[PDB]
Amino acid sequence: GVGISTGTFNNQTEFKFLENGWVEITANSSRLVHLNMPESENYRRVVVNNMDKTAVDGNMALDDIHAEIVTPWSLVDANAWGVWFNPGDWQLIVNTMSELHLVSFEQEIFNVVLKTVSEQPPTKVYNNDLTASLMVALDSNNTMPFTPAAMRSETLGFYPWKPTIPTPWRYYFQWDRTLIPSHTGTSGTPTNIYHGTDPDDVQFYTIENSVPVHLLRTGDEFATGTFFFDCKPCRLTHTWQTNRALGLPPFLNSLPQSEGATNFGDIGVQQDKRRGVTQMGNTNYITEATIMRPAEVGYSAPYYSFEASTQGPFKTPIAAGRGGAQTDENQAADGNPRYAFGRQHGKKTTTTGETPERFTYIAHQDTGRYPEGDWIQNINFNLPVTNDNVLLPTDPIGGKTGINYTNIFNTYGPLTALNNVPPVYPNGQIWDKEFDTDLKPRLHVNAPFVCQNNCPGQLFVKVAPNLTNQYDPDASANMSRIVTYSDFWWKGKLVFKAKLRASHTWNPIQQMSINVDNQFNYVPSNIGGMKIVYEKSQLAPRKLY
Amino acid sequence: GVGISTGTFNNQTEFKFLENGWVEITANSSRLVHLNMPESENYRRVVVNNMDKTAVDGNMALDDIHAEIVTPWSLVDANAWGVWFNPGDWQLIVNTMSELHLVSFEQEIFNVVLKTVSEQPPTKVYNNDLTASLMVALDSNNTMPFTPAAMRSETLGFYPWKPTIPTPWRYYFQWDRTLIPSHTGTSGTPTNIYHGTDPDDVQFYTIENSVPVHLLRTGDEFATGTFFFDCKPCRLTHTWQTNRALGLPPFLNSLPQSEGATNFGDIGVQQDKRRGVTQMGNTNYITEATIMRPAEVGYSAPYYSFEASTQGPFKTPIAAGRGGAQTDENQAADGNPRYAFGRQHGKKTTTTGETPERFTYIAHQDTGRYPEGDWIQNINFNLPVTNDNVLLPTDPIGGKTGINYTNIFNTYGPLTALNNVPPVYPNGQIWDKEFDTDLKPRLHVNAPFVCQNNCPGQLFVKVAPNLTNQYDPDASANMSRIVTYSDFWWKGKLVFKAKLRASHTWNPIQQMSINVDNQFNYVPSNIGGMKIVYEKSQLAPRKLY
Amino acid sequence: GVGISTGTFNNQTEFKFLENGWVEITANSSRLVHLNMPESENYRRVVVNNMDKTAVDGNMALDDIHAEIVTPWSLVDANAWGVWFNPGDWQLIVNTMSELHLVSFEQEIFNVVLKTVSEQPPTKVYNNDLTASLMVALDSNNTMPFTPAAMRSETLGFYPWKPTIPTPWRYYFQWDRTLIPSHTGTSGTPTNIYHGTDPDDVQFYTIENSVPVHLLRTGDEFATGTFFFDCKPCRLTHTWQTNRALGLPPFLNSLPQSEGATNFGDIGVQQDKRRGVTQMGNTNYITEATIMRPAEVGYSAPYYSFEASTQGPFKTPIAAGRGGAQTDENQAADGNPRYAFGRQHGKKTTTTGETPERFTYIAHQDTGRYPEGDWIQNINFNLPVTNDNVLLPTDPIGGKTGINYTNIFNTYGPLTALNNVPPVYPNGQIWDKEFDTDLKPRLHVNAPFVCQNNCPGQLFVKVAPNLTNQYDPDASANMSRIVTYSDFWWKGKLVFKAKLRASHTWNPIQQMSINVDNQFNYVPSNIGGMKIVYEKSQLAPRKLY
């Protein structure tokens, strides 16, 4: 098996037709994976503490205290759009499909190779250790803690012609921690402590102990079977209507007689003599702002809110962001996800420096809130409103000049309508495991697809220990082993089922196209540099009501 | 039938195996029930008013005003763990099972006996009234108002060898009531009124009028059929991860080199140069507190909040409590249920006094909040935070020194993940009827099992009126009847379906055991006193993500 | 076969259900074994003599004189709990099972690798000798002397992720030796001699001559078949009753009237007027100490007794140890086994030094003796006993101040009841071969399972001699061969059949759990250190009578 290839390199994406209106998108992605011998063949329980940062009053948000089990295993994560589609393909999908269904996923590891490194210059020499093995483990039952790499931009690379690497697997380990908020001028020293561990929550997982491990020599290969998802379809359309645009508009008794941006129409009926339905039993004022609407599209939630439980503070997450003529991406706010990433996932290949590349994804769906426009009135509703009868986003709460009621506000309720997060190409995660809590979240913010019952298992890799002639188990010093490393090929097949979009309006729709401006974001440089710019996914309208 | 037993006394709990991995827990429980002749053979509409208490400004919370129909019937309630399992059995279940399914329930009343009491000493004489009857009614269709006795510690006893009694059945009757909040120094007299009844809400139920009644003489017996539940499985595991422990931990670029509690690991990357995903479109700060998480485990809700509707104030309920190194059960707070009970349900049998025994159950699941750690920042997020740009749990709301924003705060939303309440042995209720509202609660706080469509019917008991030779219906004075009372045996069969737990981690888990400390809580005293100490139910971890 | 893996790495432990109440525990354990080229390709008859130690009068116990055949073969021993179960699994077994049956055992050697070592620095170079072989021999017929490695803490390692090694095989060779006891002040020189060998007892075994040997090259693998045990079930329960707690207790004529540790009950009958049965035909005294009991639980045996035969002195072994409020593990005594071991079997991985880690296992079963409480009276039994009529553990024997009759005493007899040794996790041996003497021991002290007819054969390993171009058989100097060594994977499958325990008492039982104290004995350190703490196996009661 030594001199024989054990697989095929395929990175094509096929489109096939089904039933009237549907297509089967088959995305193939293979890559050359380079894996190094682990730092230590041991599992470590490491604690990370950065009090020197949170010690400075008013820096609570920069807290990093946490414990983690550092395993000698690596994780092969492909859960990220960038792994399966190139710009062009994404364009096609996004411009011509209306919805996407996640169907099946399957992996394969082949053409395994294990090399060895030998030694005033000092000249290095590399040879093949034909008999050495590469350890592979597929956690089919999801015994291990779920750790999507996309969250830290550590998935496989996004370029078929650029070798990549798996990530050092590690997972959270329970720990108690207390940190009290403080501002620049707080007196004294706020309680800031790392208490330790609740034995009742201790969970030390081991791959060796709960997953069968395969040893692969050059001639061997490993293939997972095909896994079938089930999860909800993801939509490639965005809604735009807000409560103000739901239902039958008021009948205009007076229409314009000549063109012009000043020639408006008029309802033509005294505001308190209008017919209709409102949810305000006080007034007879039927206005576009008081008129009753079926339910409420979107919701208001506390912004830049940090809650805390047994392990420290964390940002209260939001379902949707905000768009419109009030954003312009520099007045960005809460809700809009911001992705930071490296050369392997989109940063210009030839750029230097530790500084990453980033972007704040601003979805096309208008389902957010503009706090500055919120306000609260007294029930009496004596409509020239008095200062004492309103609470404006301008009036200070708790005597703080920079905090107003909207920062505290929450309007989530029985009438809340809402949309799932849109796909973020190419840095976004594709699917995600559901929480194993009795009551589940109505959606996740990290990925559009959430496998309910079971998700595909995590694939773990590790170079088998290549010992020297001097090995002593009974010794305390770290074992010395031949510097070994491995390179193997990985191939995946992710299958979707999509529906072709139809033209409902008279006017054309928003489509992704190449301009005179973006043109160079889709072609290599004269040095061979590349980059993959983020792309929106729900261009085009969907009537919401 | 007079001299013949009509049933069997069985209080054993059997475990049987099924399908690979499952067991059928069959809990048998029988008891000797002592029932007295009702105070009055009539139904009464009684009002309870304690304004003299709420009159003292700042005592609103002590309000007891309410109306209730007092029936001449008694209720035989067995809905409480203490009725079906003794400590040992509970131990076994809790230590070796991972989940519990409620399967079926059936009752039986047998060996009925009716005795009579006769009369300077004065010496009493007791005889058997062979022809007297015991009235039994099984509300199969749940026509009657659901009134779980566990809520007021009035279920059957918890000791197989200790006779018990049913409880005087009574149910709520509609009434309007207004009570305005006030503090120690409020001026004037706050509106405090009991308005009366909305005829449109009047519902006077009668057992005689809607349930068939069986008369039982000594020789007779009564058995309900077997009822089959359907409800959700209850879990015997607790989650511990919080948002801070979800997903792939940050990759540490620098690991410790020697043991020690001071030798921490380090991420090794400037906080604003890190790669990853946050939901904060402003900063480039990717911190363990700002990093994006799938959804939000747990939620924040207003604490020691009392809302009011047409019948008075009531405490706003919470789903989960709080644990950790910040509790210690004397800093206890909102969320943790507190059970108060008598000698028949766990209080030391030989203790004297009207004072009950109690405990505040503190679940093992870490899904609560530590308000003191919460805080809110201005969107600009200029991370040495200014006092004017944060709202701390320390800053006063409404000029009140003891009220901060967290008391008002609510973070329940689309991303909220959550767990059902854990079983509370032995005082906790087992199953509960679901509200007949169009939209139902995602769970109940009183019991882990909530029968959706139909629940087992309530069992009502009553001693038939044993008249004297002088009875006048046309008379106004209360009828005089022979002092009669009855003793009968009750037997129940509650069936569960449980799954054996498996060992996933390398480390052992939390198990319930007998110590040198608790040792005497499971054995009788030299006088024969007993007690049943509460026990946690979800020991052991469950990975949440 | 060169570039092809020949096996699978599996270290999972599965639990499967059978018949009502039973489970099939399947423990899989694989490991990477590192084996070196033997010191000498020859068999040596070596004598060990340490008279310089025993020469010091009163040091007899430190005798080490013995002869042994040193073979060029290594032994792969897996007979030790630590090899098959991790703490968690052990917990599960011990907490939920009542008895354990040893069912089958099977091994396999795969992914064999043979490496070679080459040479002012001096820089070493390692290459693969593809054509070199690894010799394997499975003594199926148990021709070779049985040598369980657990006895000297030389089994395979206890960590799936830590490479291990086999042990240099060697066995006892007959020799005569005489050593006379002596104390610190003995005059003269006590006979201390090593006589030699009785040709009539000479047994020089050779693997080559009585076991077929397989040669394995990289591509080859070797698998033993499945071996089926038969031996007795081992119990996971401990008895606690002693003769004093057997049968019907005396009837108390006077019971306590109020709680208190001073309020005792009273038999209420003059000790010599009581009814019952005693085995003392003299007195009419029927006391809890003289009352007749069915037989005798436990036995008394001479302590720190050393007997001697043809090869020297040896400690007289005891069946059971001692527990209670008189131990506290520092007043430990005869009977309790003490295990000493290294880093590979439980000692903290990162600890330095030649000093081993140890513990003295103190079984939960109360079946031992407290000599200080023993005593002997004259048959006349004139119950204010005279000094001349009793022999106390205080009275000196042979004029020695530190020796009393109990040191000589032995109460083993026809009425002796007794229990088998409990499992010692993780350092204890699992099964053991039975002595081939016409009359066998009622149990062994080293392991709970003793295969009667036939045991699994010992697995021997050895690196085939890799000669250089200069080899001369006819030469006297030790042959020079290429420095070769091998690494191979070992996999085993040990199958048990266990029974789930049931809850018989009202009170809960003793269960193994993780505390705030032991918590860190089940998790790796920040350096990656580990340790495996010993654990008791028979927690929980078993009624003995």
Query: Nearest C-alpha of chain A: how many angstroms from B329?
Result: 15
C129: nearest Cα among C489, C487, C491, C471: C487
- If 0-12 CB within 10 Å is exposed, 13-18 middle and 19+ buried, where does residue C472 land? exposed
Question: What HEC string does A317-384 produce?
Answer: CCCCCCCCCCCCCCCCCEEEEEEEECHHHCCCCCCCCCCCEEEECCCCCCCCCCHHHCCEECCCCCCC
The conformation of residue A177, written as its DSSP 8-state character, comes to E
- Name the residue in chain A with its Cα closest to that of C522: A204
Supply B7's token pair. 């049933």
Query: Nearest C-alpha of chain A: how many angstroms from C164?
Result: 6
Q: Which amino acid, C5?
A: S
Count of pairs with CB atoms under 8 A, one residue in A, one in B: 427
Query: Nearest C-alpha of chain B: how many angstroms from A424?
Result: 11
Query: What secondary structure does DSSP assign to C316-333, as a single string?
Result: PP-S----STT-TTTS--
Query: Nearest C-alpha of chain C: how many angstroms from B500?
Result: 10
Candidate from C89, C257, C527 with C-beta closest to B258:
C527
Candidate from A148, A183, A309 with C-beta closest to B370:
A309
Q: Which amino acid, B132?
A: A
- Name the residue in chain C with its Cα closest to that of A222: C5
Query: Nearest C-alpha of chain B: how many angstroms from C366?
Result: 17
All partners of chain B with 3 or more CB pairs under 8 angstroms: A, C
Query: Nearest C-alpha of chain B: how many angstroms from A214?
Result: 20
Which residue is it, tokens 């010599």?
C272
CA B320/CA B364 separation, integer angstroms: 11
On chain B, the residues whose CB falls within 8 A of the CB of C158 are: none
CA angle (C200, C205, C207) in 5-degree steps: 165
Question: What HEC string does A40-75 produce?
Answer: CCCCEEEEECCHHHHCCCCCHHHCCCEEEEEEEEEE
On chain C, the residues whose CB falls within 8 A of the CB of A199 are: 514-516, 518-519
CA angle (B281, B283, B284) in 5-degree steps: 105
CB atoms within 10 A of CB C160: 23
CA C169/CA C148 separation, integer angstroms: 10
Exposure string over B312-348, b if 16+ CB within 10 A, otherwise e: bbeeeebbbbbbbebbeeeeebbbbbebebebbbbbe
Query: Nearest C-alpha of chain A: how many angstroms from C532?
Result: 14
Kindly determine whether residue C12 and residue A69, on different chains, have CB atoms separated by under 8 Å: no
Candidate from C263, C350, C525 with C-beta closest to B526:
C263
With H, G, I as helix, E, B as strand and everything else as coil, classify residue A236. Answer: coil
Cβ proximity of A463 and A38 under 8 Å: yes
- Name the residue in chain B with its Cα closest to that of A150: B276
On chain B, the residues whose CB falls within 8 A of the CB of C257 are: 527
On chain C, the residues whose CB falls within 8 A of the CB of B500 are: 15, 96
Q: Give kind and range of the element (H or E) at residue C451.
A: strand C449-451
Q: Give kind and range of the element (H or E) at residue A105.
A: strand A97-118
B432: nearest Cα among B290, B280, B234: B234
CA A481/CA A129 separation, integer angstroms: 13
Supply B166's token pair. 């049913």
A122: preceding bond cis by omega (within 30 degrees):
yes
Q: Give this entry's resolution in angstroms.
A: 3.2
With H, G, I as helix, E, B as strand and everything else as coil, classify residue B389. Answer: helix
Torsion of CA A191, A192, A196, A202, to 10 degrees: 100
On chain C, the residues whose CB falls within 8 A of the CB of A214 are: 5, 8-9
Give the relative orientation of helices B87-96 and C87-96 as an angle to the nearest 10 degrees.
150
B320: nearest Cα among B459, B445, B198: B445
Supply B450's token pair. 């909530």
What domains appear along chain B, each with residue ranges and CATH number? 1-545 (2.170.30.10)
Cβ proximity of C274 and C250 under 8 Å: yes
The conformation of residue A258, written as its DSSP 8-state character, comes to S
Candidate from A44, A215, A471 with C-beta closest to C111:
A215
CA B275/CA B248 separation, integer angstroms: 13
B192: nearest Cα among B53, B307, B54, B48: B54
Question: Which residue in B94, B235, B244 has the most chain A C-beta atoms within 10 A of its own C-beta, making it the best mutation to test that interface?
Answer: B244
- Name the residue in chain B with its Cα closest to that of A307: B374
- Total count of residues recorded for chain A: 545
CA C526/CA B258 separation, integer angstroms: 8
Which residue is it, tokens 């735009």?
A240
Residues 6+ apart with CB under 8 A from A496: A24, A25, A26, A27, A100, A101, A102, A103
- Name the residue in chain B with its Cα closest to that of A149: B248
Question: For chain B, what is the total number of helices (H) and then of strands (E)?
Answer: 4, 27
Rg for chain B, CA atoms, rounded: 28
**Binding site membership of B for Mg(2+): which residues?**
141
B273: nearest Cα among B283, B262, B260, B258: B283
On chain A, the residues whose CB falls within 8 A of the CB of C115 are: 469
**CA distances from residue B158 to B78, B87, B337, B427, B513 in whole angstroms, order as listed:** 10, 11, 20, 9, 21
Cβ proximity of C487 and C109 under 8 Å: no
Residues 6+ apart with CB under 8 A from B223: B106, B107, B108, B109
- Total count of residues recorded for chain B: 545
A128 is in an annotated binding site: no
Question: Which residue in C10, C34, C349, C354 has the most chain A C-beta atoms within 10 A of its own C-beta, making it the best mutation to test that interface?
Answer: C34
Instruction: Read off φ and ψ for residue B407, nearest 5 degrees.
Output: -65, -25
Question: Which residue in A116, A215, A478 has the most chain C C-beta atoms within 10 A of its own C-beta, making it the best mutation to test that interface?
Answer: A215
Kindly determine whether residue C12 and residue A464, on different chains, have CB atoms separated by under 8 Å: no
Supply C4's token pair. 């092809």
Kindly determine whether residue B525 and residue C259, on different chains, have CB atoms separated by under 8 Å: yes
Cβ proximity of B96 and B501 under 8 Å: yes
Cβ proximity of C227 and C105 under 8 Å: yes
